[PDB]
């Protein structure tokens, strides 16, 4: 029973590998050799946000590129104004440990999640001026790792029980579930058209999940160790993953195999957060060795470095208009970086 | 523009109120100590929960000193990702029983994995060895459950600096300090970490456990301040 199924699985995997080898038309570096390089990118810190006491674990920008939500391990969820370094809101948290935070595209809701296995959604529509728990969500057994808003009524949520979920915020139950992982699902990234999304997990593979159908379409196995972060290229066709083996990998959906490996010999520490720019030319990767790196996405060369954090960089975020880059680290500081000329 | 000045004034007032709230919460956060009650499995850690969702919280104060103790409840056995979130705790209370598959060796491997972790180098570990009466009955029964699992127990002598409890078989005392020397060897072999281990032998029903945790946490805090003042 087991033997024929394992042999059939090995034959199907060999067929998929042969199809990926046959569809390998050329190499991205060989056709991007005739591209002018970006050069040295020198970014300077414009603002520095100092409200959190405990280490800052995750952040998320707003769609107006004005307000940003940051979560710390002391039980504090602070909505910052990025221009004047003023804290618009401070929210106490029921659970001390928080591993994810999200800001709604409408701007009215803020979600958080951590080791309590409960996603807490807070509303900013309150006439009293005081924040409140709009809805708590408890359907995951493993620890909660990532959550991102589709809209005001639905939310895609990642947990450590090898599952992903689509929750209806109005009813309070899971609209659907996604069960395709053998490892802890570390992060998710939503597509710009919100038709698909991707999930990066600890099984050294990334999944392309379909929202309406509920099954994974594409599986990408190119990493050696646990994948920590994932983000889309801004068209929705490609995506980049960072892992613990000190290598970033840019995968393509339609090519159904990896395009490019970003690696350096002197860099041996892990990766925590990756994010593209507005155009997609720069890949911004927050490494474990106390700094960030600005890779050229076409030439695979280190265009810049952002060594501004005393402790490791936990999270990284880029505005929608592409104006500033905010990095949150474990030294209880938020650094906003912008280029100068 | 007067409207921009009014909005900026209201934003500054809200920022001052939030900074006053954070300065009121800062002393409450920094005065309170944090404990991670971690066990390998069926070790009777629920006895420590009764005496001393996903995570369980126990609040207890000794001499106006506040302790939050966090027990890991309904979580997946893959520990390699969330344990980094416990880097900044004051202590990791590692509770295992000295008494199917071998459990002492998995306990030694788990303690080695906690100790050799690069982010857990700052965090110190307080060791508790439970079920001393069950270990004593296992030794007095005559069945070989530590010579078969460990060959070093045959060529082992009781340490002279060890203080034995009166009324015990010296074979039980020898097995106790043998397991204690195994944990001390694993803790000592690293060396580079700036943290220390505290072994403690505890029976099934004890009262002195909270006092031992308080004394060990006071020792950790005083060693941290002496390390900051470069005296150690």
């Amino acid at each position, epitope marked *: 029973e087991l033997d024929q199924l394992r042999q059939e699985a090995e034959q199907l995997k060999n067929q998929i590998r042969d199809a990926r080898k046959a569809c390998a038309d050329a190499t991205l570096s060989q056709i991007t050799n005739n591209i002018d390089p970006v050069g040295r990118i020198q970014m300077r810190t414009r603002r520095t946000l100092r409200g959190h006491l405990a280490k800052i674990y995750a952040m998320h920008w707003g769609t107006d590129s004005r307000l940003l939500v940051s979560a710390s391990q002391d039980g504090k969820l602070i909505i910052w104004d990025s221009y004047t370094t003023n804290k618009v809101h401070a929210i106490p948290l029921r659970s001390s440990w928080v591993m994810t935070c999200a800001y709604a595209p409408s701007g009215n809701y803020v979600a958080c999640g951590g080791l309590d296995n409960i996603c807490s959604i807070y509303n900013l529509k309150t006439r009293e001026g005081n924040v409140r728990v709009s809805r708590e969500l408890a359907g995951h057994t493993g620890y909660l790792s990532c959550c991102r808003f589709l809209d005001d009524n639905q939310i895609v949520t990642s947990s450590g029980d090898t599952t992903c979920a689509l929750w209806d915020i109005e009813t309070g139950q899971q609209t659907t579930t996604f069960t395709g992982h053998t490892g802890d699902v570390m992060s998710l990234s939503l597509a710009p058209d919100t038709r698909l999304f991707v999930s990066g997990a600890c099984d050294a593979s990334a999944k392309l999940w379909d929202v309406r159908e509920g099954m994974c379409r594409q599986t990408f*196995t*190119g990493h*050696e160790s646990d994948i920590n972060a994932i983000c889309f290229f801004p068209n929705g066709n490609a995506f980049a993953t960072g892992s613990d083996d000190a290598t970033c990998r840019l995968f393509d959906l339609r090519a159904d195999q990896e395009l490019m490996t970003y690696s350096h010999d002197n860099i*041996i520490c892990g990766i925590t957060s990756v994010s593209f720019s507005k155009s997609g030319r720069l890949l911004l990767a927050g490494y474990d060795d106390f700094n960030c790196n600005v890779w050229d996405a076409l030439k695979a060369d280190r265009a810049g470095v952002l060594a501004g954090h005393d402790n490791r960089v936990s999270c990284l975020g880029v505005t929608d208009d592409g104006m500033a880059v905010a990095t949150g680290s474990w030294d209880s500081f938020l650094k906003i970086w912008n280029g100068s000329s | 523009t007067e409207d921009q000045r009014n909005e900026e004034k209201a934003q500054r007032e809200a920022n001052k109120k939030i900074e006053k709230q954070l300065q009121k919460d800062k002393q409450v956060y920094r005065a309170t100590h944090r404990l991670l009650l971690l066990g390998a499995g069926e070790s009777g850690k629920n006895t420590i929960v009764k005496q001393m969702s996903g995570i369980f919280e126990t609040k207890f104060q000794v001499d106006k000193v506040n302790f939050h103790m966090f027990d890991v409840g309904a979580q997946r*056995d893959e520990r390699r990702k969330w344990i980094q979130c416990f880097n900044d705790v004051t202590a990791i209370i590692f509770v295992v029983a000295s008494s199917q*598959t*071998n459990r002492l060796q998995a306990a030694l491997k788990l303690f*080695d994995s906690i100790w050799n*972790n690069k982010w857990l180098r700052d965090t110190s570990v307080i060791l508790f060895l439970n079920k001393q009466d069950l270990l004593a009955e296992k030794v007095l029964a005559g069945k070989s459950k530590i010579e078969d*699992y460990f060959p070093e127990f045959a060529r082992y002598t009781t340490p002279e600096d060890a203080t034995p409890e009166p009324g015990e078989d010296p074979r039980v005392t020898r097995a106790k300090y043998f397991i204690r020397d195994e944990f001390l060897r694993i803790s000592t072999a690293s060396g580079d970490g700036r943290h220390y281990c505290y072994p403690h032998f505890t029976c099934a029903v004890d009262t002195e456990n909270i006092r031992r945790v308080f004394n060990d946490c006071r020792d950790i805090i005083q060693r941290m301040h002496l390390r900051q003042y470069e005296l150690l």
Partner: nanobody
Amino acid sequence: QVQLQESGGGLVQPGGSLRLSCAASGFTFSNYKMNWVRQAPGKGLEWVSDISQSGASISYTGSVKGRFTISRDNAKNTLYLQMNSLKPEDTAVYYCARCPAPFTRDCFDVTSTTYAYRGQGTQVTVSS
């Protein structure tokens, strides 16, 4: 894709000899500490022995200490376990496992139920 393929085992006599091979594909072999896990019939997983990146740090479970020989080969990309003077209590399913992070001394969850990087394993029966 990280894959590990075990080879060797089967039905042996008590006190006999046996050699186990572990072929590694899909990663850089020399940068990972690796180890062996066994599963007895009717029991859970437990650690057996390990080897570091270079091969200097070698440790065993004390029930089989002095009886097994672990040896890795980085150039031929193969882990080996030599097992002589066996006992009937050593019949088990054997798992060649890799620690998940490179350039680290610690191995957190190798002995876990749904660990994703261990191999399929091999059967060894040491019945008389």
